[PDB]
Paper text:
Contrasting with Enterobacteria, members of the dominant genus Bacteroides often encode several BtuB vitamin B12 outer membrane transporters together with a conserved array of surface-exposed B12-binding lipoproteins. Here we show that the BtuB transporters from Bacteroides thetaiotaomicron form stable, pedal bin-like complexes with surface-exposed BtuG lipoprotein lids, which bind B12 with high affinities. Closing of the BtuG lid following B12 capture causes destabilisation of the bound B12 by a conserved BtuB extracellular loop, causing translocation of the vitamin to BtuB and subsequent transport. We propose that TonB-dependent, lipoprotein-assisted small molecule uptake is a general feature of Bacteroides spp. that is important for the success of this genus in colonising the human gut.
To obtain more experimental insight into the dynamics of BtuG lid opening, we determined the structure of the BtuB1G1 (i.e. the BtuBG complex of locus 1) complex by cryo-EM. BtuG1 is ~70 kDa in size due to the presence of a C-terminal extension of ~250 residues that is homologous to the BtuH2 protein that was recently shown to bind B12 on the cell surface of B. theta; thus, BtuG1 contains two B12 binding sites. The additional BtuH domain increases the size of the extra-membrane part of the complex substantially, facilitating structure determination by cryo-EM. We obtained ~3.2 Å maps for the complex in the absence of CNCbl. The additional BtuH domain (BtuG1 H-domain) is clearly visible and appears to be docked to BtuG1, in a position that would not allow B12 binding. The resolution of the BtuG1 H-domain was substantially worse than the rest of the complex, implying some degree of conformational flexibility. Interestingly, and contrasting with substrate-free structures of SusCD glycan transporters, the BtuB1G1 EM structure is very similar to the BtuB2G2 crystal structure with a closed BtuG lid, and there are no particle populations with open BtuG1 lids. We also collected data for BtuB1G1 in the presence of 2 molar equivalents CNCbl, but analysis of the dataset suggested a destabilising effect on the DDM-solubilised complex caused by the presence of CNCbl, analogous to BtuB2G2.
Numbering used by the authors:
A (entry chain B): 27 to 379, 388 to 660
B (entry chain A): 49 to 95, 96D, 97 to 257, 259 to 375, 380 to 415, 420 to 681
The structure:
């Protein structure tokens, strides 16, 4: 009588909406346990919405190995460095089948125990606990050259055409102590050029912007909590700045880095946001929605959606989680029981297994003039350095094509979008939907599915003349706040370019109000004012809504209005859709239109919040239901 | 006979049953004790520790000829260290171990495994007994043995045992690259299992005047290779482990006339453990950890009988356990046990009590815990030998020296666990007719509670495993066993035996789902088969003896999570053997042919440590 059966996982796989901008596949490498070789490589396909926990074993009919340490996607291949098995699985990207088996072995049969991989000019450079860095060609997949970098190595990175390898010396803790060195390797001659005295036990190492290398150094004792973060200037290969904040690992975008610390005595874990230029912490807790964190195993950053992926390992015995957070720290989703100790999350956009097609997801932006804000003059504002306004427009069309989020800045900043075909009028139900990056908090002060609401007024117009140009008459949609005392019609605001480039941006209105939109340390571009604007003063005209953000401390909640506004609600689960029948004219009379072509979105709320800046309407991608 | 009258749950294998249980290094015969969950490694010469009733594997105490041996470094004791060439009687006690005349270290352990050494008989004339038991086969296994016995002064006898056990042990195991069914598979050979055991023993039995002054001098040098786990795509290990265990043991017994029996035990044990890993990536070129252990053990147990049927025991102990390495701990321990109202009454209560207290002075804990034990063997129905048994026992683990003084991975503030056991059982035996000379069946439903369990949890950095008191395992299993010998016609004994265990060992450490160990609540613990069972069949014919023994273990899991991804499949280990004795001018030759793992099943009991397949073992023995 064997009543012993595999009891299920009980909790569902995904505990949130699984949406991501421009990411096709997302691969999660899970270590498993030492001497138990139950490592795995899971994937999530956002296009097919398909979750595969045992993807490598489902493909090649063989397990990945023991303690798979690193994963990286390069040149339509996935390179998986597996430590105890001492292998590098170099599996093909569109098929998922393993193409070649690289043996990371020494002259004898002893394992090199490789840990991490870095890429520079179609060579994969792999560091090991043997103290060696190996160069592997991406074509023949053979070990071409071995260099000795001294003691045991843990992570490797590429910057300024040089490999930085963190010589940890971890296994020598009972003997001569941990090593204190980061080795620098040139591409051209491929010898060890310099050895940087960095601090004891250097671990995770990553390049950043402004041509620098950030490395985490542990203590002589790991449990002692003597962690530091070292900025190394790649010009001189010397220790530039030593930050005393406790780090286990970190993920870098722009000038900021999301880093977690994890003590081993009290088991206390914290995830902070850090400014790599100012050198100070900004938020002592990254998770600002009340989502409990217990054991963050590693932290990654999506290179082309901006989200932060923190994996959970718990007691290092049960299957971990993968939690996706936004830039503000609200949880987007989490994959539950994705694998045993999920180590490293990598991302791709090329998928596995057309602009001329309509595809029900709009075609091209016609007008884009945003107000100054925290997201302006960055990659999410369709701007790069030294490009004119038409270049900003065609980058906006390109970002709309790749389903990337576009921001509108402060109050009054507007965007105008069309479609491949005219949307027919559906009577009695909704016509089109606007996708937003708003996420809901599980508990707020009030109800109505609160969270981060950034409401915006939508307008629609019909291409009656048929020229494809936004010169037709604009009709405002009557929302839930329309016609009440909670809205301020005929509001004219103007923004002034500050005389310092990096200054707070001044705005004045016709209602007697004067104020600023403030600089925050997250977004440190040249100016919050739009750089492709040639005039000093810009003005915007429209209806101002009542401010919906309420100070509860550092936990500001944008309370959602019921219906009729863009980026007011999360993009699924009702009240984010729109119909033509809400459109009214200037005089407020109801106008019935048989078809519709032009959708205009501008920000309805003029409010500063603080560390999340102004209320900014972010448009993901408009889409019709027909 | 025994195994029925015992108040605590006793199982016993005599010399002919251990003959029928074809095995070497003891732990392959331990697997048939009907409650034992063995944690094992690779094949010959692997680490083979024992859990009594799916308790901790450090809650057991194995006793080599009247004194328990105590491994302090990783206190899971190597059972495969002891060999089966000189074992007269093997026995497992789940409790008080029947009689209260033991040294105090036998008490306060949740189960003891008693290995008894061959006591020589010395039949009339014949001063000298010579025995050799040369065993060979199974991929380079060789095992010569010597058993020089000599009577000295009609009360002194001397037994010198020698055993060289060189081995190769390359098993043709079958490696699966995964856990599901559609997995590519490989036929790989096991590497680095070179075992080179050597055992020497000089035991002196002094039957003075009743009075015994049994002594033993034991030496054990080994050079076993320690194989790694079968990691995928990589099997090259060079780990060597040298053991140099030795001890000198003394056992004095005196019967000071009526109402007084006195006993002294003494033991000096020196152990050496050299672990070499030349493939390790330490910058000096490999780890060379050496551990030195010493145990000074003394006991002055006494027994005083109030009447002919009732007895008390006062057992005082003493132990100095020193350790050196490459910090350098020393544990002073003092046990004294007062056995309570032990009655040995005819058709009424056979109740017994025992309170043992312990005192350790170590920079560590200084515990003075009291441990009770009650064992009742109430027996109605005088016409048949049917016993009702019930024993409550609260024992506790001590934290090992690897759990306290390993290089800053082990905690220093470990709470020393618990083991709370409430076994209740029915034991029946009959000798009806002559078609069945002996029948017996014994069913014990037991409830073991472990609290504050010391567990090694990984940390996924340097000094990987760390000790923590995170475990509250509740065991509620039931263990049945049977021994049925039937004799058809004449001289054709068809001696059968069997055992079964419905082990329900659920981890109940934290009931809330919002916890890392809340997914482990009401879940089976890691290496514990639910429906573990065993069986034996001895066929005694005068021209050829045959024996069969099979092991069944159910769906063993991994890590306590209980998902199908970390499932281990149920296995069956079937084995057969043949025995023959020849009388050649008063010299007894013995030929033995053993086939182990008869169905060639490549199974694992601990993950990525595959057990050997079909092996053939040939034994040639010369007696006198
Ligand atoms: O040049 C880049 C390419 O070179 C190598 C290989 O074919 C690809 O993986 C890609 O990385």
């Amino acid at each position: 009588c064997d009543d012993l059966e595999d009891k299920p996982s009980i909790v569902p796989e995904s505990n949130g909406d699984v949406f991501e901008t421009g990411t096709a596949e997302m691969y999660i490498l899970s270590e498993g346990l030492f001497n138990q070789n139950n490592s795995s490589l899971a994937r999530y396909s956002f296009n097919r919405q398909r979750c595969t926990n045992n993807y490598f074993s489902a493909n090649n009919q063989r397990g990945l190995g023991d303690t798979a340490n690193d994963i990286a996607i390069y040149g339509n291949k996935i390179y998986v460095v597996v430590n105890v098995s001492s292998t590098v699985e170099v599996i093909d990207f569109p098929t998922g089948k393993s193409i070649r088996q690289i043996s990371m072995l020494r002259d004898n049969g002893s394992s090199r125990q490789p840990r991490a991989i870095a890429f520079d000019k179609d060579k994969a450079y792999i560091c090991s606990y043997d103290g060696t860095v190996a160069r592997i060609d991406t074509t023949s997949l053979e070990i071409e050259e071995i260099v000795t970098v001294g003691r045991n190595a843990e992570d490797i990175c590429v910057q300024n055409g040089k490999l930085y390898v963190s010589n940890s010396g971890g296994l020598d803790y009972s003997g001569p102590g941990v090593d204190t060195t980061v080795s620098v390797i040139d591409i051209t001659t491929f010898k060890e050029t310099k050895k940087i005295e960095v601090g004891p036990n250097p671990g995770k190492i990553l390049p950043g912007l402004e041509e620098a290398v950030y490395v985490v150094t542990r203590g002589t004792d790991i449990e002692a909590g003597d962690y530091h973060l070292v900025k190394i200037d790649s010009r001189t290969d010397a220790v530039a700045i030593t930050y005393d904040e406790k780090v286990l690992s970190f993920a870098i975008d722009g000038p900021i880095a999301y880093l977690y610390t994890y003590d081993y005595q009290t088991k206390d874990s914290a995830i902070k946001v850090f400014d790599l230029n100012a050198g100070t912490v900004i938020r002592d807790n990254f998770i600002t929605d009340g989502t409990a964190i217990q054991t963050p195993f590693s932290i990654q950053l999506n290179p082309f959606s901006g989200n932060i992926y923190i994996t959970e390992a718990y007691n290092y015995t049960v299957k971990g989680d993968v939690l996706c957070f936004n830039q503000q720290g609200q949880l987007q989703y989490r994959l539950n029981d994705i694998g045993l100790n999920p180590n490293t999350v990598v991302f791709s956009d090329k998928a596995s297994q057309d602009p001329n097609a309509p595809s029900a997801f709009a075609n091209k932006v016609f007008e884009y003039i945003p107000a100054p804000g925290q997201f302006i003059n960055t990659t999410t504002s369709a701007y790069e350095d030294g490009f004119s306004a038409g270049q900003v427009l065609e980058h906006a069309t390109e970002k709309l094509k790749k389903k990337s989020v576009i921001s509108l800045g402060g109050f009054g900043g507007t965007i105008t979008v069309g479609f491949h075909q005219s949307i027919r009028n559906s009577k009695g139900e909704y016509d089109f939907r606007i996708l937003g990056n708003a996420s809901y908090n599980q508990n707020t002060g009030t109800g109505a599915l609160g969270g981060s609401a950034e409401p915006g007024i939508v307008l629609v117009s019909k291409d009656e003349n048929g020229n494809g140009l936004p010169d037709d008459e604009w009709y405002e949609l009557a929302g839930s706040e329309y016609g009440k005392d909670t809205e301020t019609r005929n509001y004219e605001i103007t923004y002034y370019r500050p005389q310092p480039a990096n200054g707070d941006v001044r705005w004045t209105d016709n209602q007697g109000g004067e104020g600023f939109v403030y600089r925050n340390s997250y977004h440190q571009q040249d100016s919050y004012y739009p750089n492709w604007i040639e005039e000093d003063e810009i003005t915007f005209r429209g209806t101002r809504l009542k401010d919906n953000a309420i100070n509860e401390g550092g936990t500001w909640v944008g309370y959602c209005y019921p219906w009729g506004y863009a980026d007011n609600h999360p993009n699924r689960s009702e009240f984010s859709q729109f119909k033509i029948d809400w459109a009214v004219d200037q005089n407020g009379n109801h106008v019935e239109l048989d078809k519709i072509d032009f959708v205009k979105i501008y920000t309805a709320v003029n409010q500063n919040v603080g560390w999340m800046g102004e209320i900014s309407t972010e448009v993901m991608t408009v889409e019709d239901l027909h | 006979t025994r195994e029925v009258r015992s108040a605590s749950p006793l199982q016993v294998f005599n010399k002919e049953e251990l003959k029928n249980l074809q095995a070497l290094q003891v732990s392959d015969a331990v697997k048939h004790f009907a409650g034992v969950t063995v944690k094992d490694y690779g094949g010959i010469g692997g680490l083979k520790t024992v859990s009594i009733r799916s308790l901790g594997a450090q809650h057991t105490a194995v006793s080599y000829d009247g004194i328990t041996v105590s491994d302090c470094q990783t206190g899971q004791v190597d059972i495969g260290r002891f060999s089966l060439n000189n074992v007269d009687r093997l026995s497992l006690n789940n409790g008080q171990s029947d009689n209260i005349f033991q040294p105090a270290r036998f008490f306060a352990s949740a189960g003891i495994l008693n290995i008894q050494t061959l006591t020589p008989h010395f039949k009339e004339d014949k001063p000298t007994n010579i025995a050799a038991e040369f065993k060979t086969g199974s991929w380079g296994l060789v095992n010569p043995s010597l058993f020089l016995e000599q009577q000295l002064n009609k009360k002194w006898s001397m037994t010198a045992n020698g055993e060289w056990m060189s081995s190769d042990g390359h098993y043709p195991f079958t490696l699966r690259y995964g856990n599901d069914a559609d997995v590519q598979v490989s036929k790989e050979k096991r590497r680095n299992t070179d075992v080179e055991n050597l055992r020497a023993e000089i035991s002196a039995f002094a039957n003075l005047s009743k009075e015994q002054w049994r002594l033993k001098a034991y030496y054990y040098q080994s050079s076993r290779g320690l194989p790694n786990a079968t990691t995928l795509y990589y099997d090259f290990s060079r780990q060597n482990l040298r053991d140099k265990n030795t001890f000198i043991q003394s056992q004095y017994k005196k019967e000071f006339s009526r109402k007084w029996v006195f006993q002294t035990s003494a033991k000096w044990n020196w152990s050496y453990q050299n672990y070499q890993d030349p493939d390790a990536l330490t910058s000096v070129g490999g780890t060379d950890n050496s551990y030195y252990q010493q145990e000074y053990y003394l006991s002055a147990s006494a027994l005083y009988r109030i009447w002919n049927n009732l007895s008390f025991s006062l057992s005082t102990d003493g132990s100095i356990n020193t350790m050196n390495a490459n910090v350098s701990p020393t544990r002073y321990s003092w046990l004294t046990a007062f056995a309570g109202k032990y009655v040995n009454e005819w058709v009424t209560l056979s109740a017994s009590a025992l309170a043992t207290v312990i005192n350790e002075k170590a920079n560590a804990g200084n515990h003075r815990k009291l441990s009770p034990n009650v064992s009742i063997s109430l027996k109605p129905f005088h016409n048949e030998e049917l016993r009702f048994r019930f024993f409550y026992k609260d024992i506790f683990r001590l934290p090992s020296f690897n759990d306290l003084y390993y290089d800053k991975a082990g905690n220093i503030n470990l709470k020393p666990e618990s083991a709370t056991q409430y076994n209740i059982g029915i034991t029946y035996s009959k000798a009806i007719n002559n078609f069945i000379p002996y029948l017996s069946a014994t069913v014990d439903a037991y409830h073991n509670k472990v609290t504050d369990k010391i567990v090694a949890t990984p940390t996924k950095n340097l000094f990987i495993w760390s000790m923590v008191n995170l475990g509250k395992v509740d065991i509620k299993g039931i263990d049945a066993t049977a021994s049925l010998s039937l004799q058809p016609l004449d001289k054709l004994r068809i001696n059968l035996s069997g055992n079964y265990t419905y082990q329900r060992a659920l981890d109940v450490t934290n009931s809330n789902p919002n916890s890392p160990e809340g997914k482990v609540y009401k879940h089976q613990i890691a290496y514990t088969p639910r429906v573990s069972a065993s069986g034996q069949a001895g066929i005694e014919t005068p021209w050829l003896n045959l024996s069969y023994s099979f092991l069944f273990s159910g769906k063993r899991y991994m890590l306590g999570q209980n998902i199908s991804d970390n499932r281990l499949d149920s296995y069956s280990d079937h084995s057969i053997s043949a025995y023959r004795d020849f009388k050649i001018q008063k010299v007894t030759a013995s030929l033995n042919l053993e086939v182990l793992n008869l169905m060639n099943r490549n199974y694992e009991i601990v993950k990525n440590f595959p057990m050997p397949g079909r092996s053939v073992r040939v034994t040639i023995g010369v007696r006198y």
